Design an enzyme around this catalytic site. Sequence first.
Site, PDB file in Angstrom:
ATOM      1  N   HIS A   8       0.604  -1.052   0.015  1.00  0.00           N
ATOM      2  CA  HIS A   8      -0.085  -0.140   0.114  1.00  0.00           C
ATOM      3  C   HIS A   8       0.745   1.227  -0.089  1.00  0.00           C
ATOM      4  CE1 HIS A   8       0.945   0.966   4.311  1.00  0.00           C
ATOM      5  NE2 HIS A   8       0.623  -0.229   4.444  1.00  0.00           N
ATOM      6  N   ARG A  59      -5.598   0.237   5.578  1.00  0.00           N
ATOM      7  CA  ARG A  59      -4.762   0.742   4.654  1.00  0.00           C
ATOM      8  C   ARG A  59      -4.472  -0.120   3.448  1.00  0.00           C
ATOM      9  NH1 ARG A  59      -1.718   0.405   9.403  1.00  0.00           N
ATOM     10  NH2 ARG A  59       0.549  -0.106   9.160  1.00  0.00           N
ATOM     11  N   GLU A  86       1.236  -5.647   9.039  1.00  0.00           N
ATOM     12  CA  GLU A  86       2.539  -5.235   9.248  1.00  0.00           C
ATOM     13  C   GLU A  86       3.051  -5.581  10.434  1.00  0.00           C
ATOM     14  OE1 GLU A  86       5.297  -3.870   8.265  1.00  0.00           O
ATOM     15  OE2 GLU A  86       4.655  -1.893   7.518  1.00  0.00           O
ATOM     16  N   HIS A 181       1.719  -5.209   3.420  1.00  0.00           N
ATOM     17  CA  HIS A 181       2.432  -4.031   4.023  1.00  0.00           C
ATOM     18  C   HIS A 181       4.215  -4.451   3.636  1.00  0.00           C
ATOM     19  CE1 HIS A 181      -1.171  -2.962   6.220  1.00  0.00           C
ATOM     20  NE2 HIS A 181      -1.242  -4.054   6.074  1.00  0.00           N
TER      21      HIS A 181
END
EC number: 5.4.2.11
Lengths: 240, 240, 240, 240
Positions: A8, A59, A86, A181
């Site tokens: 992202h 996200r 993440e 991520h």
Amino acid sequence: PKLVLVRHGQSEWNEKNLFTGWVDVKLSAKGQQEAARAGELLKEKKVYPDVLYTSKLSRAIQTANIALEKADRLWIPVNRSWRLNERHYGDLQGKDKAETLKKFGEEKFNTYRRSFDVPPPPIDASSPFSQKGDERYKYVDPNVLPETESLALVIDRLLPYWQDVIAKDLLSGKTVMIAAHGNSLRGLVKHLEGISDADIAKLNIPTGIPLVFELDENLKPSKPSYYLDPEAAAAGAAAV
Amino acid sequence: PKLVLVRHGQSEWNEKNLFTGWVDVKLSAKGQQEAARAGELLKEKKVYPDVLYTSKLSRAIQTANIALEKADRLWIPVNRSWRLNERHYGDLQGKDKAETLKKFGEEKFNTYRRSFDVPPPPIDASSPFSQKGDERYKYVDPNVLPETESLALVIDRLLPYWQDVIAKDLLSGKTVMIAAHGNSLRGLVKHLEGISDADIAKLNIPTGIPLVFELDENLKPSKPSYYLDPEAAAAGAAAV
Amino acid sequence: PKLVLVRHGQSEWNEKNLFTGWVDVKLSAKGQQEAARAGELLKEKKVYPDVLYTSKLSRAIQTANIALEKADRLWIPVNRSWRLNERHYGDLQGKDKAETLKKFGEEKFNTYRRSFDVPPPPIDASSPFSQKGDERYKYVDPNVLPETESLALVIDRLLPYWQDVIAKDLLSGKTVMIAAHGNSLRGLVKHLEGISDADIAKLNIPTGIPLVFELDENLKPSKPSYYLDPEAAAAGAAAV
Amino acid sequence: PKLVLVRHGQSEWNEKNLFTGWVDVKLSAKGQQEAARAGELLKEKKVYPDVLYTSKLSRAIQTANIALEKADRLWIPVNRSWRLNERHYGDLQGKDKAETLKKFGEEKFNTYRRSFDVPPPPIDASSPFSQKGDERYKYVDPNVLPETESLALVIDRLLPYWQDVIAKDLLSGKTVMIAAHGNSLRGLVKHLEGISDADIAKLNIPTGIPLVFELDENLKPSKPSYYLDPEAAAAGAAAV
């Protein structure tokens, strides 16, 4: 089998210089444009995913939703897992990166940011930036949710998901797209490509440009991975 | 249990006056704003779905994605089914509504648009607007895909999904959100409220305003359904 | 694709001459031997299912478990559904077949047993043989559970499962095995072979002998269905 | 939440004195009787599982099928995973235990059989007792399937399944039953009870007698686990 990875773009905290980790912040305006570019690249290069996997962080989900809208493939099934999240940044979640660097020194700062195996200090449960008790993780064993992670620990919790769930779709012949991520994708690449513990620190995955892996029957690369836009494919750092 | 129904806002062919049916068009600019409003109303009225069901048509999926971004619930699990799709408009798909009205006369036109059980004429196989062989329906029995539908037929194919899959989530205590289409939601509302075959021709569900049902253990309404913005009700705008 | 159908062998109430329907009785001793034979025939004819579907009635599940042990394919995935259940016998459940015959006369008795569309009388709520509120159906919409069924109604509730779930496995290239009941399998065979409403009253599927359909990409038989032991065919034994 | 664990009884190779590991051998006649006893105990003590998990090995699946037949709960859904399989015995698969003891000496024999972390030598892929390429593992990443395992390695591959899948049903309020093997159940118990690496070597789980854990909201025992038949609950070894 064909695997497509998308990192992202900028979040609202990246633009304000705050470590994010598992705090669920949204994409900035530039991040939304990077997601649209990713989906335009899937369309231009005719890479049409059959199934999508995302983390549980907004996200990455917003990224996929925007990209798949641009590539006209919104109808494909969607699976989400905490194991694609993440790296958890421990007590650095919610802290300013420049303030943290002055506080710790470059040495400690760089160990926390890029060591393979030294995690940042654990976060407190009373911290406002702790995810303990968050609703989206209520059906996972509470004892496995991290209070801090290193890249080594990200890989240890990501692999079992790759091995049993994502691999099943690859082995069934589906083109899989993962929207995740920086550290969780860096972990997966380390594994597929066989990058050493010392060299992975140097690997950066540009935001918003799909990375494709063409894999054989044992899920090993049959040719080197490639970005859908090589020129843009960035090695010059964003922040690292 | 609680069920939340959301009809997507205006599509790009609704703006151009063409019958859509199963053709996969995207939301117009107005349609996108109506999706954000539905999301704001979920957040403002504290209605937080635990699972999302959509049809396989992009306009409803885009609507859910925008709404859930505004309600901050993008992480929830997502299931899609062709049984939630809009009514298939047969040979009227891709046709101008004014020209159709001039060609069949008021009487035949309102029957096709709003009778309970008279379907439009079947689409032809040549038609550029047929969905036969479309990749998103490749794992369904090819024999059940429609060439045309009336509201009665929509209800017959929707109910088995409602009975086994959506009901399971409702009976497990989940709040369920459905992002779908005028006729598939009219079909479901006819079933929940016990509206006669004569009367659901007069039922219209406004675009973009979530409709909430509070149901008991038998899945029957325990109180009247309500819209999250009662004032803005009425679908008499954007075509009566 | 290939589909294998197995009707369970004799139940403990079939031995005692009682109508069973949805009452959950177990296989008799003979029934258990018939299940082992079906398993031996799978193994002897090299028909190896990749996925199993059963109803929620123990007699069909026991049959699949014994058969797959003899065919050495116990590890395959298993899915169960109420839509594969035997026809619900209404107020005849728990009743003696000879006494019922003496009480309604031949004509009414054969209509209830074998008409296409005249169901037996509805069971009462008090009845000790009603399945209302049974724990195994607690996640289905309570309103769709039957109080009685004819073969026509069995087909109407079976087909949506066949269309979305079993078809998906068949179209993915899996060999699918279904262990189910006389009327639910008669219903499916009527649909695959295109047998008229008048003619399936004469169709009988022998107990314990797998019936194989080889289907094309449209899920239509590409060649006649066949039993794995053609000689032993005919269900005229153990009641004509 | 309530968790019920059942270890399968004697296999046909245990009775012949051969190490089994992942070789798929069936229960002996005594093993089938032990499974029936397990199911009689679930019924007598009114422990009714809502969902079943098994390994991919026939001896544990046959055990569950027999037990659930005796406890009248055959209709419950069933999930199977390779991560609940027995420890892979490497090159000892298919070897005689007495011949292996004379060949290696008691010291090496006992290290291979009961060390926490010393696996037996890896098996060769050409060995007849190797599971490489077996059909039931074709959708799992081929790189994670072991060629030998210690108990430490069993635990590392079992935990992720417990954390994401089994825990979800426990946290949803379901009573879960696991039918598995000596080392995979010893691994799980070590984890739930917090048994040290040195003490787990001494833990034995009797065959065929369900072990119940009553767990709290963090999946920790709320009281000590207990066997459904304490007297029989065996500490006197079978073979170890």
